[PDB]
Amino acid sequence: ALTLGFAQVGAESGWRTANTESIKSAAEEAGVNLKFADANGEQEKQISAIRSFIQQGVDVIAFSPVVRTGWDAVLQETKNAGIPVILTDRAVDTQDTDVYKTFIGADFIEEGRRAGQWVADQYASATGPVNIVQLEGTTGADPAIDRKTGFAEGISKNPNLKIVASQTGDFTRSGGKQVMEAFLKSTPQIDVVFAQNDDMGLGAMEAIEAAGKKPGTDIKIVAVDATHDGMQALADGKFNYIVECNPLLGPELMDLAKKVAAGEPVPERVVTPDEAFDQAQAKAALPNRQYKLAAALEHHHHHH
Ligand SMILES: OC[C@@H]1O[C@@H](O)[C@H](O)[C@H]1O
Ligand SMILES: [Zn+2]
Ligand SMILES: [Zn+2]
Ligand SMILES: [Zn+2]
Ligand SMILES: [Zn+2]
Ligand SMILES: [Zn+2]
Ligand SMILES: [Zn+2]
Ligand SMILES: [Zn+2]
C-alpha cells in the first residue's frame, strides 16, 4: 500500500466539501491508504496534523495551507524526516529552497481578472458611476489575496467602476450575510457585488432578498467556484456571472502521490482549467456536472 497524509483547511464552502469528497473518493478508487485530517480553519490544527504524519512515518504528506505564512519550520521538519510534500489549491510564503515537490491548483488571479473584466464589459456605456461591493475571502489565504488583486486588474481599465466597500467574510454563508447586510446599511447605493466564493455570494443574496431588494436585477451578483447551489442560483436568475474553480483535485493528487513516492519526475506546478457562465449557459451546464468537471480537470496544463 501507499500512505498519503492529507490535512484539509476545513469545510467552510461547498467547494471545500467537494474538494474533501474528491480527495477521499479518489484515494479508494486509486488504492491509497489515506490518513485524512481536518484543521477546521485554524493553522495550528493543520500544523499538528502535519506533525503527526511525520511521527506516523507516512510515505507522502499533502496539504492545503489555510494561510500563506507560518509554514517555514514545519515544511523544513518534513524535509529533515525525508517525507515529500505535494501542495493543493492554496500556495505558501516560504523562503527555504525545494520545500515541496509540486502544487496542484487554480489561477486565482485570472479567476478574479475574469470577473472584473465581466463587470467592466457589462458597465461599458455606464452614464454615471457603478458601485462595486467586494466580499473578501479569509484574511491570509492565497485565493483571497490573489482574487482581490486580479479583480482590480479587471476593473482598472474603466474609472466609472470603483470598489466603494471591501471586507472579509471568511468564505462562509454566515459571513457572507453578516458582511453584506453591513454594506446594505452602511453603503447607500450598490450596483453590483463581487463574492470571492459563491458561498459568501449566496449568504449575500439572502441579505438582498431580506432587505426587500431583487438579486440578479436590483443588485447583480458575480462570484467564483461554480458549486451546485451557486450554479442553481444563476440558473434561476439570482446570480449573473460565476467563474468556475475546479474542486476535483483527487484523481491527479493520487497520480502525483504515486509518482512522487516512487520518485518519478513531476512538473513544478499544475493549473486546473476554468470557464464561466451566464444564466443560460449555467442552465445547460447543470446536467451531468460531476462528469463534465472530472473531464475538465483531465485538460489541466503544466508549469514545468
Ligand atoms: O482554496 C480555494 C477556496 O477555498 C474555499 O473555502 C473556497 O470556496 C475556494 O474558492
Ligand atoms: Zn464519498
Ligand atoms: Zn526556513
Ligand atoms: Zn449539490
Ligand atoms: Zn467545466
Ligand atoms: Zn499531468
Ligand atoms: Zn508537462
Ligand atoms: Zn500557464
**DSSP assignment of 209-224:** HHTT--BTTTBEEEEE
Task: Report which of 225, 237, 238, 240 is spatially closest to residue 289, judged by C-alpha positions.
Answer: 225
Decide the pairing of beta strands 161-168 and 220-225: unpaired
**90: buried, middle or exposed (CB in 10 Å: 19+, 13-18, 0-12)?**
buried
Q: How far apart are CA 239 and CA 118, in angstroms?
A: 13
Distance 62 CA to ligand 3 centre (A): 19
Q: Of the bound ligands, which one is closest to the alpha carbon of residue 172? A: 1
Q: Of the bound ligands, which one is closest to the alpha carbon of residue 267? A: 7
Q: How far apart are CA 110 and CA 224, in angstroms?
A: 11
Decide the pairing of beta strands 85-88 and 301-303: unpaired
Q: Which H or E run contains 33?
A: strand 33-38
Distance 249 CA to ligand 2 centre (A): 14
Q: Of the bound ligands, which one is closest to the alpha carbon of residue 295? A: 5
Q: What is the resolution of this structure in A?
A: 2.8
CB 215 within 8 A of CB 221: yes
Nearest CA to ligand 1 atom 6: 13
> Looking at residue 236, what DSSP letter applies?
H
Class of domain 106-246+272-304: alpha beta
Q: Enumerate residues lining ligand 1, CB below 6 A.
A: 12-13, 15-16, 89-90, 143, 171, 197, 199, 224-225, 245
Q: So where are the chain's domains? A: 1-105+247-271, 106-246+272-304
Atom of ligand 1 nearest to the CA of 90: 1
E strands, 99-214, in order: 102-105, 130-136, 161-168, 192-195
Cell, residue 128:
454615471
Which residues in 262-283 are b (16+ Cβ under 10 Å) and which e?
A: eeeebbeebbbebebbebebbe
Atom of ligand 1 nearest to the CA of 89: 1
CB 7 within 8 A of CB 64: yes
Please give the CATH number for the structural domain made up of 1-105+247-271: 3.40.50.2300
Cell, residue 135:
466580499
- Interior angle at CA 153, CA 150 and CA 155, nearest 5: 115
Strand, coil or helix: 178: helix
Give φ, ψ of 261 to 5 degrees.
Answer: -50, -45
CB 135 within 8 A of CB 196: yes
Give the annotated binding-site residues. 21, 28-29, 72, 96, 110, 142, 146, 198-199, 228-229, 244-245, 274-275
Strand, coil or helix: 282: helix
Whose cell is 461554480? That residue is 226
Pocket mutation for ligand 1, best pick of 245, 253, 274 (most atoms within 8 Å of C-beta) = 245
Atom of ligand 1 nearest to the CA of 245: 10
Task: Report which of 251, 246, 255, 257 is spatially closest to residue 101, judged by C-alpha positions.
Answer: 257
> Looking at residue 299, what DSSP letter applies?
T
Strand, coil or helix: 194: strand
Cell, residue 210:
431580506
- The approach used to solve this structure was X-ray
Whose cell is 456605456? That residue is 125
* Matching fold, domains 1-105+247-271 and 106-246+272-304: yes
Torsion of CA 15, 18, 23, 25, to 10 degrees: 180
